[PDB]
């Protein structure tokens with residue numbers, strides 16, 4: 001069982017004040033605050049063991065290399081990949097999706113083929129596929145939404161066919177909180193020979209993620225949402241697919257040999273996908289974030305967060321003219337609009353109360369268009385958030401509505 | 406005037422011991438140690454002001470956004486770019502070169518065209534051009550080296566012609582220490598309508614860099630070599646060229662609008678080249694590294710470093726059978742081989758003495774091939790290195806040669 005007070009004492013920003021008021025940080029879905037264990041693991045690495053990492057002969061450099069490869073192995077166990085070598089270090093979910101779209105996409109999606117996405121995808125899981133489709137002459141097909149924020153799965157028989165090469169689908173919506181039925185959609189996709197990329201940016205901090213039970217072909221996530229540093233993320237690819245993928249970025253460390261008269265040859269997976277100096281400091285920080293989350297326990301985190309979400313939805317019923325978007329069983333985020341007030345104004349008043357929510361289109365324009373709204377407000381309810389912060393949000397929305405209505 | 410003792414007291418790793426001995430870190434050309442001002446600027450940002458940055462309405466997020474854009478402006482002044490908007494945040498020099506090669510390269514280099522590089526380039530400034538040439542059917546031409554480690558500039562009339570679209574050239578060699586005559590080569594390139602990309606990864610920490618006096622079209626460098634965090638670098642592009650470049654990575658924040666029925670449109674430069682959450686922590690750290698270096702003064706750093714280099718070359722004359730590679734006026738690095746001993750063995754003995762040097766091909770295979778050696782050892786002599794560390798290197802090479810000869 002979980003202790004929110006003990007957890008909160010590890011996060012230094014949660015003591016801050018904003019506008020003279022105590023911060024209520026409800027925007028973890030945009031980026032999470034980091035525990036002092038993560039902040040300090042990175043700072044200690046810079047203060048005591050820093051060096052370049054490409055298997056340098058000297059001591060600091062050989063030990064930094066081993067730290068980096070141990071982080072690769074730990075992340076691989078965290079998502080239950082069969083091996084550390086199925087994981088590539090990237091800048092974040094966005095970069096991982098771009099790597100797949102170019103490296104796998106340019107050789108496997110041809111003129112006349114199709115790719116399937118959904119109407120709830122974040123721009124990171126839309127734009128790279130629009131670019132791939134435009135480069136190769138393929139078609140981009142879209143699984144539509146239902147009013148409750150779930151996918152219309154009955155449309156799948158019209159979207160999947162013999163030309164469907166990939167399904168790119170979000171694990172958990174960053175706006176709606178919907179968890180998609182990935183295992184079943186992947187079974188479906190594989191019956192047609194299509195591969196499946198899963199955008200897990202909003203899944204890995206809420207519950208255990210097992211890529212071998214999912215059977216996904218590609219899985220991506222970002223460290224800064226998982227209580228870790230910015231600039232680091234993970235791309236998981238089944239070994240047999242990764243081994244056949246050609247390099248995306250070129251440069252040092254991804255090569256086996258470089259010649260100006262005989263050409264260049266590439267090293268093996270995963271190192272063929274990592275050109276130049278990696279983000280070593282971010283990788284040390286990400287390992288520490290995975291150890292911190294694992295020590296708390298993702299099933300404990302999930303129980304606390306679900307309890308907090310039930311509490312907030314129950315209290316939000318006393319806000320007049322509140323519109324919520326998404327299913328009742330939503331994870332992590334609450335997307336809402338208040339009466340006829342523009343989200344930008346509701347968010348500005350909430351910020352004047354010390355409450356940080358996100359407002360706007362949340363990098364999901366197609367989703368805003370589905371709901372016929374230009375924008376929404378969104379409250380994130382993470383493992384360090386409390387009942388008292390939920391009460392402050394409810395009181396604030398009641399005050400706002402009283403004032404502007 | 407410079408004080409090495411005061412400077413060294415800012416770098417916590419320089420107090421470390423390795424193998425029970427006092428560390429002599431002579432591998433700054435692979436990656437530099439970081440001052441506590443840089444380490445702490447990043448850690449303080451995570452402890453007190455962390456938030457997502459895409460002009461979020463709440464306070465923390467709006468202040469993190471302004472910090473990031475102020476770092477863009479400071480880096481732009483550091484290299485004397487005409488505006489902050491000519492600078493793109495990337496993971497490092499390698500990623501910046503890949504961005505240029507795809508985004509500028511795919512639209513401006515056609516079948517039958519040629520691109521010019523040099524035989525001393527690092528793999529980061531070779532491989533992306535080999536990939537571009539293979540995608541578009543162009544030719545890769547090479548400026549050869551002279552035995553003293555300088556370019557054979559008399560071969561330029563045979564390499565530049567009416568089909569030459571780009572010159573990609575290193576400012577300062579990471580192995581030889583050669584500083585290339587960039588301004589004159591750029592004048593030459595522009596007479597043919599060719600653009601010039603400069604790899605400045607080993608230039609920005611040794612002396613003032615002015616991109617408007619160079620007149621280069623593209624300029625790239627990495628923060629981790631400039632006493633800053635890993636995972637962050639800078640790509641500078643003349644405004645008129647950048648404004649016409651199409652996006653490379655796609656995703657959130659680089660878009661103006663996203664539609665599944667009307668297509669997607671892009672935001673303006675530089676933001677069109679930055680997809681997804683940036684490395685905010687690395688950007689805060691990079692600003693701090695630029696302030697630290699600027700407070701010391703690059704002309705002061707250059708005077709101290711040149712004095713230290715003169716001292717080392719003069720003392721290295723008492724090492725029997727030492728071979729040096731590169732010009733006498735080399736900057737930052739000393740590349741050498743000891744008698745007939747393999748560099749790997751010399752580097753292993755130097756490490757057993759607490760001395761960190763780099764050994765191998767230094768991500769410059771063509772350069773090793775030119776000199777008909779498989780590998781070299783390399784000592785870096787940065788602003789925090791001392792006469793006493795140089796004496797330890799000289800004594801160690803004499804001891805090694807006595808032992809193994």
Ligand SMILES: *Cc1c(COP(=O)(O)O)cnc(C)c1O
Nearest residue numbers: 276277497498499527579606627
């Ligand atoms: C180190 C280096 C690079 C690559 O830098 P990363 O920081 O590894 O991207 C490119 N060119 C030169 C001359 C270098 O020294």
Ligand SMILES: *Cc1c(COP(=O)(O)O)cnc(C)c1O
Nearest residue numbers: 092093094122174201222681682
């Ligand atoms: C945040 C997010 C992304 C993009 O992550 P970056 O860390 O910005 O690359 C992609 N998908 C979803 C669902 C997200 O929430």
